[PDB]
């Protein structure tokens, strides 16, 4: 299962000037491209090394798609102002996300496409990819307009054929990086609180993909601290799970780690 | 590649 996903953001800038259009492309958990119009030379650029040698024809197409979106979104921002009876005074945010997922057979599983205005759901392409639903009741005009002009058909074709054709082109392009599994380098650490208490921390570090599960047992559900999965900065990810353990009786707590790159799910305990 | 066409809301 792989996914080609894209994140588009346009923010209106009263006083500052034209709005800010940012496009962020992802192959699974890897960012590979970006377009930012805040820059004076706005072009779709590589953000992964397996894109560093691609050719003008590609960058040209992608800059145009992004440029033409920025153009529409700039208008959409003034249209959305009218729907919501808003003024030229405030800065508002239009967000568009689209993506396709592969099945286990390497064939199209699902496709999604949505719009949001000011962080709240706006319009959504249905699971069938044949119509649009106004999630917000202000999105009702956009919904009739887009269903009546048969817009979904353009997206159904992208999500079902283009997105998938390309997801494979990219997956091959960076086989050595993307498909390679980096399993987490684990270790448990001991940080004493008081004479009575002590904190036992399980560390999952340098893992790709970002999907992981970290659990403490004796099942010990009752008050375990778990931090959000964070990026290391080099492409890999980090995660830790902590539990309040009574002094001396440390070994009574076991850490369970489950990641894709691991043949056997690893279980840990602290070594003094 | 990103979607070549968007929506005019």
């Amino acid at each position, epitope marked *: 299962s792989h996914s080609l996903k894209y994140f588009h953001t346009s923010v209106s800038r009263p006083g500052r000037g034209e709005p800010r259009f940012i496009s962020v492309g992802y192959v699974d958990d890897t960012q590979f491209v970006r377009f930012d119009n805040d820059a004076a030379s706005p072009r779709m650029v590589p953000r992964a090394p397996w894109m560093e040698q691609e050719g003008s024809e590609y960058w040209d197409r992608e800059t145009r798609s992004a440029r033409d979106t920025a153009q529409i979104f700039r208008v959409n921002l003034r249209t959305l102002r009218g729907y919501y009876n808003q003024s030229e005074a405030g800065s508002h945010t239009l967000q568009w996300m689209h993506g396709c997922e592969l099945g286990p057979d390497r064939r199209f599983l699902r496709g999604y496409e949505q719009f949001a205005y000011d962080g709240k759901d706006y319009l959504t392409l249905n699971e069938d990819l044949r119509s649009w639903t106004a999630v917000d009741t202000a999105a009702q005009i956009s919904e009739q307009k887009s269903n009546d002009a048969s817009e979904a058909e353009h997206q159904r074709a992208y999500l079902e054929d*283009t997105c998938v054709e390309w997801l494979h082109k990219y997956l091959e392009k960076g086989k050595e990086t993307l498909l390679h599994l980096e399993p987490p380098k684990t270790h448990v650490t001991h940080h004493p609180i008081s004479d009575h208490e002590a904190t036992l921390r399980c560390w999952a570090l340098g893992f790709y993909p970002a999907e992981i599960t970290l659990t403490w047992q004796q099942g010990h559900t009752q008050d375990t601290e778990l931090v959000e999965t964070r990026p290391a900065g080099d492409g890999t990810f980090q995660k830790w799970a902590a539990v309040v353990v009574p002094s001396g009786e440390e070994q009574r707590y076991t850490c369970h780690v489950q990641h894709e790159g691991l043949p056997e799910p690893v279980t840990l305990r602290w070594k003094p | 590649v990103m979607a070549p066409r968007t929506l005019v809301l």
Partner: T-cell receptor
Amino acid sequence: QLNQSPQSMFIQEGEDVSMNCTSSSIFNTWLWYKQDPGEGPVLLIALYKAGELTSNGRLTAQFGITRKDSFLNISASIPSDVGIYFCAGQPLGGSNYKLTFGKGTLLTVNP
Amino acid sequence: GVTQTPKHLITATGQRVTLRCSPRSGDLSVYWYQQSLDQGLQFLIQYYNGEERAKGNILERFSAQQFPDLHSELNLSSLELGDSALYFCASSANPGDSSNEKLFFGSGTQLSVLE
């Protein structure tokens, strides 16, 4: 790229007429325009959904389940239907407001 | 409405000419086409909310622009004999309208390039 057929049509008054349109690539919306000599093309019929048929007076257009063809029919010809009939379309996958035109079909009605 | 000026134009070979278009009020898009003696509507250039959107093989000597007030200008120079045709301006893209992509033309500019 579109292809209109026949290039020219010589019909007798009262006779019905059909006009063909074909794309090399898959299309998603079809537009039919009439152009009276020296004047700007004027919209006759818009088609948005596959197999849909929509009429405007004696004029009737069809979408074509193929997504690559569209037809225009003039029911009873009156001599005023003289002119060029242009076929325009929204190519599937084309960015917003991209729409190709045909090279037109010349209609001649004999009173 | 789609208003075009001048309705007619006669000039000499080598000279420059400027064609104006005022789109339908609310419409954000401007298209320039040229219809020759037999030829259909051969497309030149397209604008969207002041910016260029599409180019369709303009002669380099052909030049265009859309102003913040969505009016447009089609500059043609140095003029050559074969550039004699009807220049049509098309308007669309009003987000207010349900069928935005529906194109509206004006009664063109007839350009006669004479020696």
